[PDB]
């Protein structure tokens with residue numbers, strides 16, 4: 160995509176009441192938005208080319 | 216098949232008996248007719264129904280594939296994941312197919328058994344008060360009306376009550392007509 164540079168992303172799960180500490184000096188790509196895990200349960204990531212069908 | 220009754224010494228079934236799997240055809244002066252044996256038919260239905268439910272139920276827990284993804288240097292565990300998941304599909308497929316085949320045999324032989332046993336219920340009731348014809352039928356040595364027919368079909372046939380009439384007939388038969 161026209162770039163010879165590379166971007167490398169990382170992640171962690173930050174428990175409630177815990178904190179995450181960044182320090183940097185360059186080349187940092189900082190967080191803006193993050194995700195609360197609001198509810199957990201059974202799901203899956205299906206691989207399908209299809210789109211939504213209005214059904215149950 | 217194994218018991219030699221269905222499509223054996225009784226050759227072919229009755230298109231005109233609709234209210235059961237096994238039963239009777241009777242024939243006397245007052246006519247003819249078909250009649251299911253309710254009790255054997257119900258036991259058969261009970262039997263096959265429990266069997267099918269038991270098959271469904273035992274296959275209830277059984278391997279359920281899950282998608283897992285792997286990167287370009289996890290080719291070995293990606294393969295081990297694939298073969299493993301395939302490994303179970305094959306086992307269960309074998310289990311299902313072979314179960315169907317073995318139980319179909321059992322089911323078909325089950326029915327054969329039910330008909331033999333029904334014939335034999337009649338046989339050991341009548342004894343020499345009737346003549347075994349060899350084709351699934353009995354020919355009485357005495358008159359057996361619609362009421363008497365019902366007694367046979369439901370276990371109530373009284374042998375001593377007709378035994379006298381039977382021995383008298385056998386004597387005429389011996390003279391040759």
Ligand SMILES: *[C@@H]1O[C@H](CO)[C@@H](O[C@@H]2O[C@H](CO)[C@@H](O[C@H]3O[C@H](CO[C@H]4O[C@H](CO)[C@@H](O)[C@H](O)[C@@H]4O)[C@@H](O)[C@H](O[C@H]4O[C@H](CO)[C@@H](O)[C@H](O)[C@@H]4O)[C@@H]3O)[C@H](O)[C@H]2NC(C)=O)[C@H](O)[C@H]1NC(C)=O
Nearest residue numbers: 171172173174175176177178179180181182193194195196
């Ligand atoms: C991310 O933020 C969270 C919220 O801001 C932080 O949670 C907090 O943890 C700290 C410990 O690091 C707690 O500090 C004090 O804990 C108790 C006081 O108890 C309080 O909470 C109780 C809840 O059960 C109440 O029942 C109490 O009445 C009271 O309100 C004390 O043991 C300490 O006070 C004493 O000690 C310190 C020295 O450590 C002195 O400086 C004080 O003056 C005093 O002498 C703790 O300070 C804090 O209570 C807690 N916050 C909440 C809302 O529960 C979390 O730690 C933070 N994460 C990181 C990684 O920093």
Ligand SMILES: *[C@@H]1O[C@H](CO)[C@@H](O[C@@H]2O[C@H](CO)[C@@H](O[C@H]3O[C@H](CO)[C@@H](O)[C@H](O)[C@@H]3O)[C@H](O)[C@H]2NC(C)=O)[C@H](O)[C@H]1NC(C)=O
Nearest residue numbers: 359360361362363364365366367368369370371372373376
């Ligand atoms: C199995 O079926 C048999 C045939 O129905 C039945 O036997 C019958 O029972 C009674 C005996 O008391 C009689 O039924 C009635 O029939 C006529 C109707 O026209 C009446 O006029 C009679 O007086 C009589 O009360 C039948 O005669 C009798 N049949 C025979 C062949 O014995 C059995 O009871 C049934 N078995 C069971 C366990 O119930």
